[PDB]
Every structure is written in C-alpha cells, then in structure tokens.
C-alpha cells in the first residue's frame, strides 16, 4: 500500500544538519516579525510544534498575523490552474526574514537619496537599474605580455 | 488501560463553571426502550407479511468499543461524558504502576 503522510518523504529535508544538531541559537527567538514582512520558510527538524508542511519548506510568504510564539504567513500555492492563498501558523524557529526584501528596501533608501541629490543639482541620476552592457572598446598592451603560443597536446595514456 | 475513579475537571453546571472533583464511571448503553418512535415504526413495518424490512448488520470488524467515562460532579451532581481511544482492556479500579519492582 502507498503511504502519503504529513511528513512523508521528508527524511533528508527535515534532517537537522551536520554538526548543527541540538539546541538552537537564540537569535531566531530574538528576531522580530511584523505584519507585512516577507519571510523565508526553512523547517527546523528539532522543533516539532508549529512545523510547516514539506510543500511550504523553502517557500516565501508575507506575515499576516503575529501571536505568542508564532507568525501567520500567506503563501500562494499553485493548485491545478490557479494559485490559492494558504495561511500558515509557523514558529519563529522555522521562520526567517528575507535578505532579498532587506536589499530592496536598502536600494529604495539609496534611490531616494540619489533623487534628492538630483533635486539638489540635477546630474542625470538615472534611477533605474541597467543590465550587463556589452563591454566597450579597449586597448591591451603587449610589453611584458608578449603572446605565448599554445598548441594542442598529443594524446598520452597517463596511467 | 487504567483510569482513576476520581478526576478534577471543568464542570459547566451553571454554578461551578470551574474545575471540580468528579466521580468517574463507565457509561452503560442503557436499555433500548419500547415505545420510542423508531421502535414503534419498526414494529409497525415488521408486522404483517413481507418478511424483514430493514437491514441487519453482519459484517462486524471492530474488536473494541470506545470507552466513555461519565463524570458526576461532587458539587452540583452534574454529569459530563468524555470518550477515550479504543482499548481492549479497561479498568476503573486503580492499581498504581510499580516501577522498581521485580517479577
């Protein structure tokens, strides 16, 4: 008979770590999550209450509720031909903030700084990001760097 | 299993509304009374010709019944029922478990 339990096929996924077993460091309990914060889900195998499902393992959501030792996270899950909004009551041990959102907020603050600078003098700030442009022309010297000619090597057993 | 004869639990008896001592007993199904509406209808349907008129179960699979404890509050004599998981053996008299004894 087939087996599809709550923690089915979660052996290595919920495997704790290598040389990171045991108690958890208290930074995780010290972190503060407010409503609207984007957070990453990585289940902790040593904590068994508030554990997320293996589907939500590795997903990212928005905090919508805060409780004593937990946080309500909203995840859009693809069910068939649409995403449904699932609400999870996860614990702070399993939950973790989003460096991507932190970086975006830092970029927003910087962007505002450059716009203020432009309003100060207007030096064509170009707020937006640009992709990797093709490299322009350059002149490379040969003094001290005379080209060393290479040739394909003959085959040898090397055993 | 073994369950104590006395139990301190919540009593919603309009006077207690708080935890209180309860005498614990096993719930008995009670006698299936005649003159219930279902029994009257069954007797009317069975009377006459035609034979059996309703299903008779035969495919019994469970070897256990869910033990239900009736708790009588010592304060207001209010009764509360709570079911337990299926257990082949059940006991109300409490012979406490002895840990460091031989045999």
């Amino acid at each position: 008979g087939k087996s599809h339990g709550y923690r089915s096929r979660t052996r290595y996924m919920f495997q704790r770590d290598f040389r990171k077993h045991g108690a958890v460091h208290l930074s995780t309990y010290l972190k503060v999550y407010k409503v609207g914060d984007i957070v990453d889900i990585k289940a902790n195998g040593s904590i068994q209450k508030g554990m997320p499902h293996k589907f939500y393992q590795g997903k990212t959501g928005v905090v919508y509720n805060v409780t004593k030792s937990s946080v309500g996270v909203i995840i859009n899950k693809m069910v068939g031909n649409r995403y449904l909004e699932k609400r999870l009551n996860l614990r702070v041990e399993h939950i973790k903030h989003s460096k991507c959102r932190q970086e975006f907020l830092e970029r927003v603050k910087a962007n505002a700084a450059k716009r203020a600078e432009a309003k100060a003098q207007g030096v064509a700030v170009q707020l937006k990001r640009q992709p990797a442009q093709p490299r322009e022309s350059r002149i490379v010297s040969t003094e001290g760097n005379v080209p060393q000619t290479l040739a394909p090597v003959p085959y040898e057993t090397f055993i | 299993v073994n369950v104590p004869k006395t139990r301190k639990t919540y009593c919603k008896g309009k006077t207690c509304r708080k935890h209180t001592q309860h005498k614990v007993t096993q719930y008995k199904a009670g006698k299936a009374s005649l003159f219930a509406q279902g029994k009257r209808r069954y007797d009317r349907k069975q009377s006459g010709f035609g034979g059996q008129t309703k299903p008779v179960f035969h495919k019994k699979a469970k070897t256990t019944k869910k033990v239900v404890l009736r708790l009588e509050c010592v304060k207001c004599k209010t009764r509360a029922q709570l079911t337990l998981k299926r257990c082949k053996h059940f006991e109300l008299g409490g012979e406490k478990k002895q840990k460091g004894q031989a045999l």
């Binding site: 919508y64 509720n65 805060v66 409780t67 859009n76 693809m78 031909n81 649409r82 995403y83 449904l84 | -």
Partner: protein
C-alpha cells in the same frame, strides 16, 4: 482487463490554456484569522480615529 492507472500528461497544457494567472490582491485584506484581541483593539481604534477625523474636519 487492466487499464492505465495514472499520468500527468497533458495536465500542464490544460492548466496553461487559461491557467496560472496570479490571484488578485486587495488593499485592506480580510482581518479573519488574525488575533481577536488585536481585532477588538483595531475596532476601537478605528472608531476613535473616525470620531477624531470628523471632529477635525467638522
């Protein structure tokens, strides 16, 4: 007379015909499932805010 048991063939195509478009988001999401203590406090705070705003712009 055995038959095919299960397959995921054609399922993604059927989904993507008119499918995986994102769900629509709202300002002021539903306050259901949030802490009822916070709900009571937010109700009272909103009532007071409306009263104060009406007083400010009579």
């Amino acid at each position: 007379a055995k038959s095919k048991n299960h397959t995921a063939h054609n399922q993604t195509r059927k989904a993507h015909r008119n499918g995986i478009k994102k769900p629509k988001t709202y300002k002021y999401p539903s306050l259901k499932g949030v802490d009822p203590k916070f709900r009571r406090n937010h109700k009272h705070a909103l009532h007071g805010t409306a009263k104060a705003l009406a007083a400010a712009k009579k």
